[PDB]
Amino acid sequence: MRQRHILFANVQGHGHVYPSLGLVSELARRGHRITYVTTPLFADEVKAAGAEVVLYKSEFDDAETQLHLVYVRENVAILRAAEEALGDNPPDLVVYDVFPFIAGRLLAARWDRPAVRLTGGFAANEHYSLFKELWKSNGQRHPADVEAVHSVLVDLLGKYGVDTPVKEYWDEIEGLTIVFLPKSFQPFAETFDERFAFVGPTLQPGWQPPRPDAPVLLVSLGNQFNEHPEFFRACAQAFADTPWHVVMAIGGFLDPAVLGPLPPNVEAHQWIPFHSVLAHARACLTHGTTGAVLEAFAAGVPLVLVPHFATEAAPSAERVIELGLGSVLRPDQLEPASIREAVERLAADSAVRERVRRMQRDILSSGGPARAADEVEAYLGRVAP
Amino acid sequence: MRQRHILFANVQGHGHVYPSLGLVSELARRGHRITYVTTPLFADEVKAAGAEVVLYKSEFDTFHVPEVVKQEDAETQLHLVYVRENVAILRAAEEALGDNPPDLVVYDVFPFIAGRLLAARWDRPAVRLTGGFAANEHYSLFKELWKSNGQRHPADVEAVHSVLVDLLGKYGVDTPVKEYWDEIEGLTIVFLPKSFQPFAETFDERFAFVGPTLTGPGWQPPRPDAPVLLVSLGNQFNEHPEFFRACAQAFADTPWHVVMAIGGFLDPAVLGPLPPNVEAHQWIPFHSVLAHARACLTHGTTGAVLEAFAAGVPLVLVPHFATEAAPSAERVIELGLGSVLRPDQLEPASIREAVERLAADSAVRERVRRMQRDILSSGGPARAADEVEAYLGRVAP
Ligand SMILES: [Ca+2]
Ligand SMILES: [Ca+2]
Ligand SMILES: [Cl-]
């Protein structure tokens, strides 16, 4: 009955953009006007999803204070991009990813508009915060307790008539937070109140196994920038002369020729349709970021993780192990025979398999992009009648 | 809505199964028990979508080699295999569900005889699905095809008619065969945007035009403003390496960057050395490439067409590569959303000039952008699930 003008505040990067786009499309499907702040790198992708784009220039084009400060400057960059573009015509709603939460909430404070937080990672409240656990494990102070960071945030927050102490503002919970995870994957899930919606992951003729009885393995380390020909060769060697059929997605940087001849039961591709392979897979060998792990569990496929290939993968990998949904290979266990052994043990573990099938069920019932849009619209109902 | 037991009856084949799958998942998300009739070839895909599988044995396992080179009555044989395939699905579903029928039968248009007979015998409401044009008293793609082929309606062929009268009678149906064939379902979910439908204005509220299930490690172009062409002929069982080589030749030493998706049956090594601005892959993520593309050169199946238009990319069509592509291809040309190349028009220079002309055509550009908006506003699986749940509310709450 109402068209809403909805502004997305998001940082550039595959991991931050991709999970959001299903929601952007479902809201545009519903007749809402989507504006989305991003860089030229993701502009075309965001427009294809149905949104109008506001371009910002990314900063990513004492080491931790510098990581902290640039983080602040990136929020400032997105903040100023959105203000200049929208100007004397505020949107109805600000939806922002956790990374630019400074930008998002300040836009909402400056326009007097409600906001929604988006997260493709674990939710935070007073009982669990992944960010607090990370700072702790690295012996870092909370950024708010860092003078140089604290100083800039005081200035920034004052400009926007915010007098809230920096550490508290930092820890405030949004009116609504859409969490793109199934609830059972969330640490301390039971403590998370009504303002948190665990909606799960957003998600060519496809690939078909050449031999219908063959156990299928998917190997992927994402679309890496740095190249691991050695690992893919070791995987090829590991499953040569076994009943397995192995599909290796090597990304857009590595030339499949580089891997040399492959046996007939191993295939390598820069790009593969992941879900079509996972639908047939008995296991998946992967880096273990949140995205990768949930795609596998959405298809009921147990995991062997190699989290040293992905820096973000640590918390997600840790959770997989914690829940008994997969195993992990250390960098000293990457000889072909070791890879084989780990994959076979995991694939044969019927306890892990049943846990993963229950996770598949929890993903399915989570609700997806349609529910995430229903949540957005419902929220707008409450704070904007 | 309370959990319902919903049965999907579908034929095997990517073009029939894939568009249905978004709806399957969205219904399963809502708590519904989904059972889905298919073959082993698609059993994994359907299970991953959230359905339990009832297997059937396809006539097309062994009707591969009987009809390739025709003797006289090949036309009649084609109709008879269609009927047998409907019967294969009907028998499998009845055997599997036995004395415990589902609450609702959702059938694809190809097995409509199976779907409607299951619904009659079980005394249940039914929903029709189609990935192609809807039919009513004003328009029927099949009637136009038979007409253009100079062949009789299958109901007017003696061998087919006799089988069908007998089968219908076994389900307490004495409706004349041709009349029955044309009856309109209580609800039809059409996976097309309404504007793409011929005689769209004549379709009443029993037809929901929900559009294609939408698309979306991302591929990036080599320069920000590189003109990008996507070339795809689908997952061709046939080797057309010459065409891909011709495409590569066409754009060598031009600023274009060409991405060729050659499918899972062709080794890209077969193509030989490619120019540095041309890349070939068995699989590519179509959406990532289309988001940057200025044009798409494609066979013109309804699936591939709507994918291109979802991204606002105009098409150059080569429909002779896919017999299934003629209706969609003709619609694209009729609407001015693309051009077409014939078999004699496939020399490299012909390909390059055709693509350049199409990509520069502002009028096409604008009509395609209107089609993109239609598709984006069509509603998709969430709307399709809403329509199914609402229909249940009315006819079997
Ligand atoms: Ca891009
Ligand atoms: Ca299959
Ligand atoms: Cl129809």
From TrEMBL, chain A:
Concerning InterPro entries, the annotation shows: EryCIII-like_C, Glycosyltransferase_28, UDP_glucos_trans, UDPGT_MGT-like
So where does Ca(2+) get bound?
Answer: 41, 45
User: What molecular function terms (GO) are annotated for this protein?
Assistant: hexosyltransferase activity; metal ion binding; UDP-glycosyltransferase activity
Residue ranges of every copy of the Erythromycin biosynthesis protein CIII-like C-terminal domain listed in the record: 259-378
One Pfam entry name: EryCIII-like_C
Among the record's GO biological process terms, what is one?
antibiotic biosynthetic process
Q: Which UniProt keywords apply?
A: Calcium, Metal-binding, Transferase
What family does the entry list? Belongs to the UDP-glycosyltransferase family.
Name the UniProt record assigns to this protein = CalG4
Record organism: Micromonospora echinospora (Micromonospora purpurea)
